[PDB]
Design a protein around this ligand. Structure first.
Ligand SMILES: Nc1ccc(S(=O)(=O)N(Cc2ccccc2)[C@H]2CNC[C@@H]2N(Cc2ccccc2)S(=O)(=O)c2ccc(N)cc2)cc1
Ligand SMILES: [Cl-]
Ligand SMILES: [Cl-]
Ligand SMILES: [Cl-]
Lengths: 99, 99
């Protein structure tokens, strides 16, 4: 698709068999989802937002579909304001900025 | 331009006679820059994300140049750890997400 930015670029994702809404965020280096259950072991990770750094859970090599496009990569889980697809998976689906 | 997301989409902007580096951020509703002076009236606002919220000053109808493209819009100024170009200005330069 070509997605304009007059509104938030919210899209449907699928992870763990579940559909969710997430924001395509080119400012986010890393994908971060709201609290949920994922398989395997996790590792600690700090991410920095506008108000400082917080600790989230890092799960690697997670299958996730984004607007119908398949990805497998790192998914962080924590108290994000909204589900966010960050540059690590936007690159995988071949997303670019254009003007 | 077509901008890759392998790295942070950092561009040069010109605002208030100043050259600055800023992130093209599709997750940001608003443009938010580190502390600087801008002309005209302003009013306070709070913006937030992971880490919490910060207080900023809101200036309207500010002229900014982004990668050579001129635009007009609201700029927020405050203690952000990164200069952010948000959707309110990305729309004006014709910026889209594409995959
Ligand atoms: N990996 C990663 C890093 C940071 C974050 S975040 O700070 O939560 N976050 C997501 C978000 C917050 C609020 C609403 C919608 C999206 C950031 C990332 N893009 C937009 C948002 N921001 C830009 C940013 C902040 C820190 C580092 C790099 C960029 S922001 O400053 O919080 C912001 C929030 C609200 C408005 N109006 C304008 C700007 C999330 C994941
Ligand atoms: Cl990854
Ligand atoms: Cl505006
Ligand atoms: Cl348009």
């Amino acid at each position: 698709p070509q997605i304009t930015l007059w509104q938030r670029p919210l899209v449907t994702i699928k992870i763990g068999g579940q559909l969710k809404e997430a924001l395509l965020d080119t400012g986010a280096d890393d994908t971060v989802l709201e609290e949920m259950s994922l398989p395997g072991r996790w590792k600690p990770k700090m991410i920095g937002g506008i108000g400082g750094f917080i600790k989230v859970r890092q799960y690697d090599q997670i299958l996730i579909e984004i607007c119908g496009h398949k990805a497998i990569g790192t998914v962080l889980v924590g108290p994000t304001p909204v589900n966010i697809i960050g540059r690590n998976l936007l690159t995988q689906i071949g997303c670019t900025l254009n003007f």
